[model samples]
Target chain A: GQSLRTLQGHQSAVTSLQFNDNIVVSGSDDSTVKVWDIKTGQSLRTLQGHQSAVTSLQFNDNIVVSGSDDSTVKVWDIKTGQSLRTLQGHQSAVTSLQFNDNIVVSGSDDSTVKVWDIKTGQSLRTLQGHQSAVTSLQFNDNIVVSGSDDSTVKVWDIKTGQSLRTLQGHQSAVTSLQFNDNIVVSGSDDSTVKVWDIKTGQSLRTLQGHQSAVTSLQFNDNIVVSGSDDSTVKVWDIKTGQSLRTLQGHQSAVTSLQFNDNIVVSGSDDSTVKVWDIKTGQSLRTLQGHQSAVTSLQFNDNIVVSGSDDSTVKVWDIK
Target chain B: GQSLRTLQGHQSAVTSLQFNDNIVVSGSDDSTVKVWDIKTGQSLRTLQGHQSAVTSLQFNDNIVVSGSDDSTVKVWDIKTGQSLRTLQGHQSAVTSLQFNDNIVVSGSDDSTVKVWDIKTGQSLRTLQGHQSAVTSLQFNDNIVVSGSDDSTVKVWDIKTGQSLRTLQGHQSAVTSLQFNDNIVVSGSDDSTVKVWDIKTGQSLRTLQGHQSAVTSLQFNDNIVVSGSDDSTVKVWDIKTGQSLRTLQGHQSAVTSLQFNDNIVVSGSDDSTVKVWDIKTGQSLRTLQGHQSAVTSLQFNDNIVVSGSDDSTVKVWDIK
Candidate 1:
């Protein structure tokens, strides 16, 4: 697969990033969200609502979901770039978000995950079980997976609004998570990534190698890639439960990771995004220019999008 | 000497606190400021201005200055608690304030520092030297010292409104600054406190010991105490350029430091304030109540005041 092109314009650190087809959305510590063209690397629109750092972002179809340190979720119309509604209920920072067909789910420092109606902005359900802040969330099928400061991951039933099971064992705050049809994966401050059975809620494997906390995780087909505070990118074979290779050379903590076909992309505290070849674990290319720590990264097709502490969302082309 | 107690009634974290002799004022992340009786700790009045966290506060005899993450500053009447005017200049979060008899100064994530008039709230001067966001500002006599993310201290002249000099040496962003007589003391991300001569705009000495970035600095007489990311407090003799004592007890990075008579009080990431005997450098007492990181601290004759990440302000009796 071809690499990507970048778009840049935010005035502060971009904390959250997401991509969907032609559009890339980014949330920044500047309390703004920006939408950019994937291929052209041109900024299309800006969304402002959160009174604090926009910490989490997700895009689905015509809608954008932003979780902010201001303790609210703002829903925006992607086409018009207008704030459609404000989801207010979380008592602390809304740290992460995911959306299903009808329900938009959010995780918060308030230690609860909420599911809300996309159009009406009404709370459909609240799933509470974590003892600390929920840092990340993922929703797929009927299952909702959450990572929390309590050092545990929990699976919730979206329809019934109940925590179905708690997957324990992480020694520190769980920072990120991902979900698929058959399994769930969680990243933690404990520096380990755990793969779980989707139905049983049981931790299947503990993948460890990072010298510091694992900050983000993602899965693509048979591979799982993780970014860590150790300033490295790790790729794992999901079936074998083995770390396949380590991509090194980041100057600071790796906070986010993404994959586009054969390339693995990572965002880091080093203020750059490095692309690696999945097969050889060799550094294929590096995108530099972010003025601060890159907090999140996402890929859609050929576009690699990065959010950074420099308060900017930068889009770069992989040649 | 005894400390005077003022300003009470915040149900949440008081993120910013300021006082004059007759009145005390506090701004909370709760989005409100309360003016209080200086001797009674009873709230005299309240003003609602910012839509989000009120992060910085400064008060002179007549006007109260506040900057919020909402990217605006509101000037208010001390006695009436009425917002006299709102200044809309900064494009990002305002982090610090310095008020004099004639002007109001503010530092913002917008990477600029601005000075406004007391009566009209009109921005009179813009001091643009820092390449990164400004975090703190202090005016000493004719010179204004600005600490910035560019990791430098800049001195500006009030009369000509010109940047006289830039003190470049700190390895990280300067977070806080305070002036005493001819000395300008700065706390920085480099974990060292530097004392500068205001007259010549030259750094005199670097006091190092804290293992993390110094977050706040306070100078009284010849003693300079710095709070740092290393979770410790270090007191230095400004004239000798040596760390006289190290206070190691806080479980988190000390965020703010204050000095009064013979006492030193510090607020920390641990959400607690501990008073110390400045002469002996011994722990006098610990005041614990704030539920989040204690971001600021100040002491009066008999009372200790603290601001926190919790969005509430707490007044403690200095035992």
Candidate 2:
């Protein structure tokens, strides 16, 4: 079945969103975190507690973690759809958050990264190295990698809260990043992408073709899919540093994206979501319904969920 | 009668042009200088002498003096339309020339300024101070001023061939200049206009607003009018540096200009000659005939003569 759903909560901009399997969670400038039933296009829960815009979020099977412009991060129970615990320490906005199992790591506009105990909601340790706002962060195992507006990326041992290595080569703010155990990949504000050795801070290769900032990227050791402000999405070979394909036709900045093994789903500021072949980079279809910049999106299997500044969420199924 | 005439010789790009009230003289890449009657729209004489492009020219009622890419300066009679004398010393293209009855000063791509005896056709003195090509020049009485690719404007003694003052401040090539006795006005590749005190070597007020390089300018002691690659004309107060008006609407670079006390006339790469009020900076009329970039122009009273890369000269009555 090929189906599309426009989920309505049309009041404030949907700023951050994530989804897995049948569930999608979205956070908005309305200071609300919403849980959605993607199969029925219904908002299952309106999790409200933060006083300002929700800027970052991640979710799992049992819980939701969200960071807000109110300088707070909240842990929520997925079943009850209510705020379970509020983590407050950042002096400014909390911009990025990712949590897995019992560990929650968040980076903030205050230039600090904090590790939290997911079950108890206790702030574990504060990692400080970035001279400016830490805009993006992700963790695998006990290792946390964070990129900052200072144009540097820091690798930290979250267990000890110590910065292990610093990667400083980008000419502008490192805006987005995702990594695995052996390699760390980052895209920055200067239209470039870099890959570094996770343990040694060795720069392996750089991908340079996009004429604007790389906004979002996803990779899995073999191949990388990236979006840019140049209104194009590019696929690159991770091991060889070769440009695989450049996906074009977007009318504005490709703001966010997600991918499976066969297809890539990307959202654009032009109010449209596009699907492209992961191998050929050829455009396959456009999912159109959002009224403004599609700020965040993710997909797993045949499901694509996107949130936009138009204060609406879109759910797509391609089979 | 308000009149317009498209004078056509149809050979090569008209590189330089100048006019008094009735006659227009044009130098071209065809290696010839042509004199035209403005009232009748007729080419009276084609003064063929230069082996390459005639890049610069100045004329009085009796004679026309031209400098060429052939690295030669040739003087031609107005009535007879024949080459009177050739001054040869520069090792590169002569790009700018200014003359009076007794004296002629020319600047060349050879990075040297040569002062010559107009009557004797003798190279009197060579002023070698600029480290790069002298691109524009002017002379009043004994003072000869030149702007160069060296990012400097130099004031020299025409009689003694001595450098009197070197004005520095512009961060790029000084491409255009005009001055009276005490103050020298220059525009540069850095999108700025600077006024310099000729004798004291002090920089006066600067005109700042143009987002592109100033390509040509005309100024008197009280006021200044300049054209730029930003596709607009600007008028300014000479002493206070107050922006008077910005004449907009041109579709491309305003490459050349001329003005009287009451009006300003400019030619743009947009293939039109525009007339503007010197006081209000409002468009008066547009003379449309040239099919390409207007490279050089001059005017006096109601008569405006413009030459373009289309190998045509236009004589317009702007009254």
Candidate 3:
């Protein structure tokens, strides 16, 4: 089935969507971030303070962290749905972000990544290395992983804000990244997915399958899944560096991908979403409702929420 | 988000759905099988002949194979919607079925598994070992795996229909089964999932987490995802038997689940479908549209199609 509910409020394209148990926080080209009740599917609050489009965001149980083209990051209390603190440091648009319970990591067009203490709203340190805009980032308790338009992936120590290692291989912009334990997985505009050893700064394997730029990717201990401009999604074996399967269905370029060990869910410019079986390389189902290209998507055990250039956010049933 | 298209034609509860590309074939308690054009959300044809409920079904590119409570198996031409053959052998209700290009294998309440030649409509062989009704089954080129209410899983030789090994461990009925080249994963009413070696028939590991019966499951080479009556879905490492994450959000029993490399889609008696991040164990969104229990679901890379007790089928856009 497709959209179970379509939340319509944003006057422009929805740019980002983040959700947990109680609410869904969405940022849009309308220059606002709206929080929706997870159960009721009604707009709970509209926080309208950003001067420009909100580009990236992350949230947890108590707080919402967002980055904007206004060249700033803001923290909001989930209970009141009001702005709590605004951190200003980036000289250009904040393009990517990741936050944990204690710290918020943000990357910007200023070609630098900064860490901040969430409780104090104080800039901890600025880690400078990328020569171009940082497009994506992910962090855990120990390290921050960043992908940049400079065509590199960097691992930074969270405590010292020091560059731990620079992974270089992609010929074009590194568009997406994810890291866990000792492994770093990066997707690039060069049309390849690469796995790296964070400790030694060595490129472990280059997964070549996509015919165009890789727009999104995610990995765990065993497998890596990537979505690309090639209108296909590919799954790889992280240990052997082999392409396990290629899921083909989307009519336009794939813009986002999320997967578990058994299933792959992909969003595309064709205004559709698809679910695939990783082992059989067979498309299990297709979801169609969006009126334009789907820009952002996230799925958990019970639901799939997608943001589209059609100026709406949709919640879908994949069960 | 809501259902993109709600196909209304079935007279009773839909129990099974099989999809290939843009075509969907469904079986229902109304004693009929219906074919749908997913692109149009239209009922293409209705196949009627079975005297009782159609319990299980599977379709490939050319044929629709269905098993019924009337103790018969039928094969139909997909394009013409014409019955090609009627397989009569099971002494009781046909419970589960799996088929490929050349062969069709079926399990029955008679406690036997039968292999039938798809082209000739001839019984190839019969596998007899289970002490009670066979609840689920799966097969590839080499082996056929069947689960039973007798609390055992049997691996059989496809060509000879000879029992290769019987895996015994579950304390209750084995409700679901899936297998690949190396492993056989089974879910049971005992609230546990077990991984077994297909070649040795040895129990390798037992994954224990669900508080109620494990109703459905799907696994790949790396991970096992299980849905339970506890209203939770759990992901486990196949090799280590370690519970990776437990996804909880559903208000009722999770009756069906499917996963590929990236996302896990689950259906429940809560009248909702959920999509989840397999790696983070996060509930990304909730799809709410069904007015009754969602009984059956299937999803591929593009769309999700679900059948409900409301006597309707819904098609969704996930992209």
Candidate 4:
């Protein structure tokens, strides 16, 4: 069941994307970051400074922050499509980044993380300790949590630029991670998801159910949802570490996933997007249209937006 | 014959040393930096904060900067022997450092170099482009030069923290390097010494006479003096790249060297120290004392101070 709305201005494979009410912002291998009007399926603006593939990006209401394979991070003013500044420090591709209002924390394949001032574009600190490439990271004002190919998660103090503690359990590269104030959750190539007490630097639980590499994951207070190379999406209780439900439908590996209280949505290498009702563990529909792998997906309210290797953005209404 | 002035306090190998008018500063594997009165061969003051071996050090009028295997760089007050602060960023051993009035530049086994404000103890920038451990480095106020186990030399701009260019002629790890305003002179494990135009990143001359790895090197405006594992010390014309002379007497590898206008002094693994007159290509004296390899040496006005694996410092009068 393909949606009637699809945004198609991206010239190459879409690698990263996010959206709000009417705007879907996407990054592509074509070295462009584009803002689109999802409701009208029209291109709004195009950011053109990235010298190579735009690999990762995130945005707030006023600014867009994007990382590139060109080994630079660029800041853009969302409304005016103006390139504000470029951060040039990482020796290799910037693999991941996230920003709050004041700061941007970036992870790179050069085995380091850097904290920067978002407004002035000044580098505050380089957090170094990882023995291998940093794969995922999250930061608040006080601290930063990073997972690496070294099979360890390091907590760095934002002000001191010192590693506070190393959370160790994963036997392989920790691939994905997210953190709240109290707990940090991570997924790894060792086919396990781990929960750790953020302040204690101790493992709270090892959620070992995924048969293959856990590629992406997210969690709310109630449940943890993960997509895996095992071709399945699984749900777990955040508190009890119990497997809540397995949303299994995709014929190929699940590449990206998002879940709400009622629904779990997945985009897969099988070239289909599936939405499931977690309350009954029943899939509502199979959305199929992409000619290649779906690279990323975001679920908000009753709408789902995804980008694919097919060089298009798809919007689905789950009504 | 050995010099009669021997200062013995270190419990382990002396790895690095420097000297001025009446004082010699030495750091050892005993995790201590000791200030010595060279005139009386007396231990003046010992500074302690490093938990592991202190590997490299440099000093100015008021401050002493030392790097250690504990993965930290410490700053000290020269007059009071007071520990000012510690710079903790590298994940591995801090191998080399040099500081001017306002800034401290350090290299590490972590494959990075950091610039810090000497007064405020704030990291100004991380010079990151080396793919292997930073072996040696030198810097001015505007530009920083570094060599690495990656077998390349990188010139980085100090103000912008960007790699200006990479000098790529060393076929093996560049073990040591020093630069003047216009030229960079480097010693490599490839058994060659290379002179490069600093601003242009072009190799001007490759002094290819060392039979084994070039272990140490220093250059003045007119000549380049190098020591090698080939059990010989060699001199070259800086501009012409011609081998001016080869002083061959050491029974083992020549480990360290220093030179002024008149004298070129060398320390060797044969547990001996030799001074050569570059004017006539003559061996002036063989000043010996240490029972093991002479690890480091410094030459000032008329005195030569050396450290050894025998855990001693010997002061020899060249006059």
Report lDDT (CA) for all predictions. 0.75, 0.81, 0.82, 0.84
Better candidate number, 1 or 3, judged by lDDT: 3
Give the per-residue lDDT digits (tens) of candidate 4, residues A1-319: 4586989877556889999897889998667899988789899899998765688999988999999866689999989999999998886567899999899999986678999999899999999988656779999889999998667899999999999999988765688999999999998866689999999999988887776568899898878899876677888988889998888877656788887788888888666889889777789988887765688999776788989866789998776
Steric clash pairs (candidate 2): none
TM-score of chain A of 1: 0.91
Q: How would you encode candidate 3's per-residue C-alpha lDDT over A1-319 as one tens digit per residue?
A: 6568889887666789988776888988656888998767899888876766688888877788888866789999877878999999886668898887788889986668999998999999999877656788888887888987667888888888889888988765688988877888998766789998888889999998775567899898888989876667888899999998888877656788888867788987667888788789898778888766678988887788888866678888886
Query: How do the candidates score on chain B by TM-score?
Result: 0.90, 0.95, 0.97, 0.97
Off by over 4 Å in 1: A1-15, A26-54, A61-65, A69-91, A95-319, B1-13, B20-22, B30-32, B37-46, B49-52, B80-82, B199-202
Candidate 3 docking quality: incorrect, acceptable, medium or high: incorrect
| Worst 10-residue lDDT window, candidate 4 chain A | A4-13
Residue-by-residue lDDT tens digits, candidate 1, A1-319: 2234445576555667777767778876567898887767788888977666677777877888888777789989888999999998876667788775687889876678999998899998899887656778888668788887666889888889888999987765677888888888888755689988878888888997775567778886688889875567888888888989989877555667777668888876556788888899999788887655566777654556676554566666665
Regions of model 2 farther than 4 Å from truth: A1-3, B1-319
Deviation in Å, model 2, residue A194 alpha carbon: 0.4
Which candidate gets the maximum TM-score versus the true structure? 1
DockQ (C-alpha based) per candidate is 0.09, 0.01, 0.01, 0.01
Q: DockQ winner between 1 and 4, please give it.
A: 1
**CA lDDT, candidate 1, residue B10:** 59
Model 2 scores a C-alpha lDDT of: 0.81
Residue B67 of model 4 has an lDDT of: 92
TM-scores of all candidate predictions against the true structure: 0.68, 0.51, 0.50, 0.51
lDDT ranking, high to low:
4, 3, 2, 1
Q: What's the best-to-worst order under TM-score?
A: 1, 2, 4, 3
